[PDB]
Every structure is written in C-alpha cells, then in structure tokens.
C-alpha cells in the first residue's frame, strides 16, 4: 500500500513549497494521479484478501472505500478554492495539508491489519477534521460543533480501546486474520455483553444511531464544504466499516442485543426523514437524510446476512457520492445567495439549467431511482431484513416514500418555482461547480453499470 | 461600537474582469490552465481510462473458474449418476462423531 | 420535541450541566490555609482506619 501511501505523504511537500498560485493546480492534479493509482487497488483475489505486508492488507470491503477517498480528495480541492480564494498562502497550504493528512489517515485506517492500529488511525481522523470544522468554519456554532463532534466520538472511542486491549490480552492478537481464523464462540456472559457494547457503541456513535446522532446536524451543517463532504461521504462509513470488521468476534451474542439498536435505527430512519421534510436549511436536510441512510446501513450490519452486507457496502458507496454532491450543490446555491434557508432563493431551474439537472439526478440517486447503486444497495438490505423479519418492509416502505417527498421537496422549493426578484447576484454558472458535479455524477452511473466491484467481500 | 472593524467586503464575481472566467482564480491564464488540468485528468485518464481499467480487470472472484469447474463436475456426476452435490460439505466418515 | 429538546436534555446537556455545576463547587475554595489544612487533617484519619486502608 506504500505505492499509495508514499505518494500521498510526499504530496505534502509539493503543496507546502509550491508557489502562491500553483498550490491548487498541483494538489488537484497530483491527487488525481493518486486516485488513478488507487484505482488499481480494485484488483481483488477471489477469496484471499490482498496482504501487501504484515501491517497492511485489503479486501473487497476496504478497497472500494479507499478508492472512494482517493477519488474524493481532488473533489474537496475543487470545491474549496471558491471560499478559500481570499486567504494567505500559508493558511491555504495548511488547509490543503489538513486534507492530505485526513486522506492519509483514512488510507491507513482502511488498509490497517491490527484492530488497535485501525483504532489509532480511525480516531486520528478527528484532528484534521476538527481543525477544518473549527478554524475555517463560517457559521456560529462551529466552535460548539467541534466540541460536540469530538466528545461524541471519544465517548464511544475510549471504551472501544479498553475492549480492544482486553481482547489482545485474552485472545492473543488483534489481527483481523487471526481473530477470524482463530475465532471462538462468545458466551452469553454479562461481562461479554459489556465487551460487545464497548466494541459496538463507538462505531454506532459514528454510524450514527438514532438518539446519539446530534453531532451531524450540528457538525456537517457548520463545517466548510470540503470538511462537510469528507465527513458525510467517508467519515460516516468509518463506523460501518469497523462494525463489519468487528462482528466476526461478536457472535452469537449480537442477535440478542441486536433488538434494541436495530429498531432504534429502523424507527429512527423515519423520524430523521420526517425531520428532513420540515426543514428550513438545505445542509441540515442533507445531514438528516445522511443519518437515515446510515441508519439503514446500521440495520444491514446488524442483520449479519451476506445479502445485508453487500447491500450495506453498496449503500455506503452510493450515499457517500450522493451526499457529497448534494452538499456541493447546496454550497453553490448558498454562496450565490450568502444564506442557507431554502426559501430565500427559489425558482433557479430556469436561471441555471445545468444546476437544475445536477439537482435532478442528485435527488434521483438520493431517492434511489433504479438501477442506480443506491437503489440496489437499499433493496438488498430490504430483502435481507424481510428475510429476518417481514414487518420491517412497511417501515422500510415508509422510508423512501417520505424520502421521495423531501427528495423532491427541496428541488420544488429551490429551483422548481419562481425566482426572487430582489436578488440579482446569481451569476452565470461558473464551470468549476458544473464540472465538479460531473466528477460527482459520472462515476456513480459507471459503478451502476458494474456494481460487482462495490458489492463487498461477500460477492 | 468599541471595535475597529473594516466593512464586510462585497461578494466579488469572477466575470467582471475576464468574461472567460472558469471560476477558479483571479488570473485568467492560471484559471484556464487549472481548467485544462482538471478536464484532462478527471475525465480523460481517470474517468475514461479508469473505466476501461475497471471494465477490463483480470479474473474477478474466480467466477469464470467457478463456472468452468462447475460444469466439469456436473458432467462427471450427472454422467456417472452420482448426485451432483453432497448434502455434507465434508466426508462424515473422516469426522469422528462424539459419543 | 425529540431532537432539539429531549435528545439534547437526555445526554449532552445534562452531562455538561453536571460538570458545570460541580466544577464550581470544586474550584470555588476560599483559598485559606486553615481550611485546606483542616481538610488534610480529616483525610488523614479517613484514610488511616475509617476506610481501614491500613488493614
């Protein structure tokens, strides 16, 4: 993985010494070649995970997420120099450095072999995101955002650390391959119940589960766009990925304690969706939609069914792409209006036809229009849940319904109407954002064409 | 108001100076060059060439090997009359049953 | 009612208020030497045999 790690690390000196004008160009292009190199990592052996070294390995679950992060890295670079144009060169270089360190930590996380190293980099993603959210944020509760986000993450992270070190003392090693091959049945002891809770609740905090999901409507809504997309697209996937890794040594106990959280998500995905309907801000609506989709992924994880795992992975990838695109579109409109209430600027479909389209298939993919990978990922989870329990369907059946409502509602109330007369700053569509939504959208349908890649390790 | 503060700068659109602005930066030449580099690398060698790559990997999950061994053992077992698959994935004789 | 009221009150705000309230009673000492050494004194026999740390 050092064919991807070493270039990512060496990307830091390039930006840190590039001229006052070349930082954006150089970072964008070289991150694009980094994504190209990581495109190779989609090469997967039939059943054996690709073990590059002792400390680094990859399989059909880590590789798609890694490719997602590496391909994403140019996208924040393209979305940031709009709101980062009027800044000192050193400050811009550090913003870029925060982004590269974030991507590097995500790569080491996804390619980590020992659970402790996975925890180290997984949590270590907090710091660059914290700096991005706090310093470069524009709204008020950004300072409150950082506190909420850090403390919510850590409150689950530390018990996970205690559980992992206890596992190391008892089992012998935290290596994934060992704990899977040398896996042993888990007894229904209450100490084992608390161990399962410690191993689960950190990822479920970052999932998020309903109830303890307040860090997203107070974090993604406030972060700069680059931070917002890197949060929603991948950082949410950290908990799902960790759960998929950890349920190997968390059975057969899970089912007995699967009952509270599963429905907590199942019911929660309704409320969040309902919360999406009666929203006032675009970014908050997208954040709550992300919460609902991630709750569906939670249900997929706790079913522990092959089909559930494949649908889960597909939903993570598709949701990352769709949420990043929706946040980018919201930023474009907000910057054009310097406000975020989704009533101030409506009826812009005529003014910006390409934005009107980009919003149209962004909503369609968010609404999971078949045969997009969003729809197949959702439907696989629906079928797995129905096999696990029939009634789930109606709740599932409710979700996209309400989702569809808001999935079109903002499009009705932001572009499908009459323009506001007193505003005039809406200029011609700068081709930067249009191109950015292109690099968002075309890979989505490309993966729709061949979903065997994002299908996960169960395929 | 006890706080010497400059007035909030106006929201400066890129089109007023060079109409050909691509919304990247002030200077038209480097703005245009960033256009060329993105529209090259994002689409040409990553989106298009990368799509040829992902559409044309080598054997994935050995599914073709799975089929080309599958019909082989169907030929064998169906020809000799043996059931085309065994209810046990492991031979019960070599498995020592407790008690 | 749920998100911005009950969900804030159930976990983040309650813990924040608890820490806020009782960090005040911890850190508002009058700073007098007499009461500090009196507390040291009380801790002496509390650790000595009241908890029976000796045995």
């Amino acid at each position: 993985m050092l064919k991807i790690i070493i270039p990512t690390t060496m990307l830091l000196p390039m930006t840190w010494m590039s001229k006052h004008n070349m930082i954006w160009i150089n970072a964008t292009v070289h991150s694009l070649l980094i994504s190209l190199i990581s495109l190779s990592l989609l090469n997967q052996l039939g059943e054996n995970s690709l073990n590059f070294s002792l400390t680094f390995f990859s399989d059909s679950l880590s590789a798609p997420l890694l490719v997602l992060t590496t391909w994403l890295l140019p996208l924040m670079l393209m979305a940031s120099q709009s709101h980062l144009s009027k800044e000192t060169t050193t400050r811009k270089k550090l913003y870029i450095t925060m982004l590269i360190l974030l991507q590097l930590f995500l790569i080491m996380t996804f390619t980590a072999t020992e659970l402790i190293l996975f925890y180290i980099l997984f949590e270590a993603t907090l710091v660059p995101t914290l700096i991005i959210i706090t310093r470069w944020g524009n709204q008020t509760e950004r300072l409150n955002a950082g506190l909420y986000f850090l403390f919510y993450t850590l409150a689950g992270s530390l018990p996970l650390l205690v559980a992992l070190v206890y596992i190391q003392n008892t089992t012998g090693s935290l290596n994934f391959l060992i704990i899977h091959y040398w896996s042993h049945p888990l007894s229904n002891s209450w100490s084992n119940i608390f161990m399962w809770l410690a191993c689960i609740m950190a990822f479920m905090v970052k999932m998020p589960l309903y109830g303890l999901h307040l860090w997203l409507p107070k974090a993604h809504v406030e972060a700069p766009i680059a931070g917002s997309m890197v949060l929603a697209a991948v950082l949410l996937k950290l908990g799902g990925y960790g759960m998929m890794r950890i349920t190997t040594i968390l059975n057969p106990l899970t089912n007995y304690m699967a009952y509270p959280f599963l429905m907590l998500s199942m019911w929660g995905m309704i409320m969040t969706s309902s919360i999406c309907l009666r929203q006032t801000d675009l970014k908050s609506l997208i954040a709550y939609s992300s919460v609902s989709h991630m709750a569906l992924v939670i249900v997929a994880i706790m079913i522990q069914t092959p089909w559930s795992f494949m649908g889960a992975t597909a939903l993570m990838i598709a949701h990352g792409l769709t949420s990043s695109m929706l946040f980018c579109l919201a930023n474009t409109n907000y910057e054009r209006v310097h406000s975020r209430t989704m009533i101030l600027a409506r009826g812009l479909q005529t003014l910006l036809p390409l934005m009107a389209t980009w919003w149209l298939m962004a909503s369609l993919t968010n609404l999971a229009l078949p045969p997009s990978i969003n729809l197949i990922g959702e439907l696989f989870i629906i079928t797995a849940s129905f096999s696990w329990s029939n009634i789930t369907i109606i709740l599932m059946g409710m979700n996209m319904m309400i989702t569809a409502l808001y999935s079109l509602y903002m499009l009705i109330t932001t572009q499908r109407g009459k323009y506001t007369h007193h505003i005039n700053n809406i200029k011609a569509s700068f081709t930067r954002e249009n191109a950015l939504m292109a690099l968002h959208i075309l890979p989505l349908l490309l993966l729709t064409l061949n979903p065997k890649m994002i299908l996960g390790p169960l395929y | 108001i006890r706080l010497q503060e400059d007035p909030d700068p106006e929201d400066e659109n890129l089109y007023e100076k060079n109409p050909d602005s691509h919304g990247y930066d002030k200077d038209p030449i480097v703005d245009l060059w960033n256009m060329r580099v993105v529209f090259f690398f994002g689409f040409s060698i990553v989106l298009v060439l990368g799509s040829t790559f992902v559409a044309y990997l080598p054997d994935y999950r050995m599914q073709e090997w799975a089929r080309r061994e599958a019909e082989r053992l169907v030929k064998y077992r169906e020809a000799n009359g043996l059931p085309l698959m065994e209810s046990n994935c492991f031979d019960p004789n070599k498995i020592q049953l407790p008690e | 009612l749920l998100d911005l009221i009950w969900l804030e009150t159930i976990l983040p705000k309650t813990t924040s208020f608890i820490q806020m309230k009782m960090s005040i009673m911890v850190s508002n000492q009058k700073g007098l030497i007499k009461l500090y050494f009196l507390s040291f004194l009380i801790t002496i026999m509390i650790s000595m045999t009241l908890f029976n740390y000796h045995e």
């Binding site: 944020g137 524009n138 008020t140 | 706080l3 909030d8 700068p9 | 806020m20 005040i24 850190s27 508002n28």
Partner: peptide, 26 residues
C-alpha cells in the same frame, strides 16, 4: 466573512472564572 470573535465574545471568559456564581461575587 466568517464569525471572528468580537469584544462581547471575548469577555465571556475574561475574568475570575468563566462559570460565574454568587460565590465568585467580586
């Protein structure tokens, strides 16, 4: 223009303690 702290934001913790009570007094 992102919110940069102003005078009233600065005074919220600039003095005695940032958790004022009657015990803080003066």
């Amino acid at each position: 223009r992102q919110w940069q702290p102003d005078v009233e934001w600065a005074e919220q913790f600039g003095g005695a303690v940032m958790y004022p009570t009657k015990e803080t007094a003066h």
